């Protein structure tokens, strides 16, 4: 249909949401998740060292 300036308007909104998510949203969640997953694996490593 009508190709329109909205193409630029949406591109600006898109890049702003990408940069706020990238710095502010993804590293905090992945850091909390991986901190849990790592400390559980540290439990597995402790059980192996105990038997060994």
């Amino acid at each position: 249909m009508n190709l329109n300036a909205t193409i630029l308007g949406q591109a600006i909104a898109f890049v702003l949401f990408v940069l706020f998510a990238m710095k502010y949203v993804w590293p905090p969640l992945m850091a909390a998740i991986e901190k849990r997953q790592k400390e559980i694996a540290d439990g597995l490593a402790s059980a192996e060292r105990a038997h060994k």
């Binding site: 009508n2 193409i7 949406q10």
Partner: protein, 266 residues
């Protein structure tokens, strides 16, 4: 009410727009010809859903517990783990952008498509009868401009990664030699590799647009054409089938974006 169904459908297809050179809202039948004429109602819902996504994810990102997670936290981490698993299967470089880009695309497009499930007249009824504005159609992804904006963003990215990760010498070497590797073929290969690259984003955008636009057009046709008692029996099967469409169209947008960036850089 002086509605013929063909006109009712015609009104339902039309957007609301604003002239950037005159600051006038656009008429039910008289558009300005100038391209500077923003589609305001889809912008409004597009940013409202982008805000609602960023609010929900930042709210848990600040709260996040490393112990047993809260139930809402559990759903947000579920989607984070699903995205991360897909990206890490398809992509192997260190580039920090890929995962947040895939998340933002997936969630934003999912919420936009989810807007179509809502009853088609209820918000247009509120917007015209309460606010007096001459048109409203609420599904942001059911317009080409937004999906091409996203696709052209990904096209810019594809060109940025393909230059940045292997340079003009390699990039031209790919675009000229393959497939047939001889100079007489280079004129042909420049055409083929160019239109192939052009088709990757444009088809990315048009795949989402066609499915969502006709998905809405069916609900418009069902409301306009049929009597009230009959409208439910046809409406319900299409709504439940549409749930499967809205999910797959979001997921395919995300996956093809990752596949193209991993194929380009690596």
């Amino acid at each position: 009410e002086n509605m013929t169904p063909q006109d009712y459908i015609g009104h339902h297809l039309n957007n609301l727009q604003l002239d950037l050179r005159t600051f006038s809202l656009v008429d039910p039948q008289n558009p300005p010809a100038t391209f500077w004429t923003i589609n305001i109602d889809s912008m409004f819902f597009s940013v409202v859903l982008g805000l609602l996504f960023l609010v929900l994810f930042r709210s848990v990102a600040k709260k996040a517990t490393s112990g047993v997670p809260g139930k809402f936290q559990t759903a947000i981490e579920l989607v984070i783990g699903f995205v991360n698993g897909s990206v890490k299967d398809m992509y192997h470089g260190k580039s920090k952008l890929i995962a947040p880009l895939a998340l933002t695309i997936f969630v934003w497009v999912f919420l936009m498509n989810l807007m179509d499930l809502l009853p088609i007249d209820l918000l247009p009824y509120i917007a015209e009868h309460v606010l007096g504005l001459p048109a409203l159609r609420v599904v942001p992804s059911a317009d080409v401009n937004v999906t091409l904006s996203m696709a052209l963003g990904v096209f810019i990215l594809i060109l940025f990664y393909s230059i940045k990760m292997k340079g003009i010498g390699g990039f031209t070497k790919e675009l000229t030699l393959q497939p047939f590797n001889h100079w007489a073929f280079i004129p042909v290969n420049l055409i083929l590799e160019g239109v192939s690259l052009l088709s990757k984003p444009v088809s990315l955008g048009l795949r989402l647009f066609g499915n969502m636009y006709a998905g809405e057009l069916i609900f418009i046709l069902i409301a306009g054409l049929l009597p009230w008692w009959s409208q439910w029996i046809l409406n319900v099967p299409w709504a439940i089938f549409h749930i499967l469409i809205i999910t797959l169209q979001a997921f395919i947008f995300m996956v093809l974006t990752i596949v193209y960036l991993s194929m380009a850089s690596e």
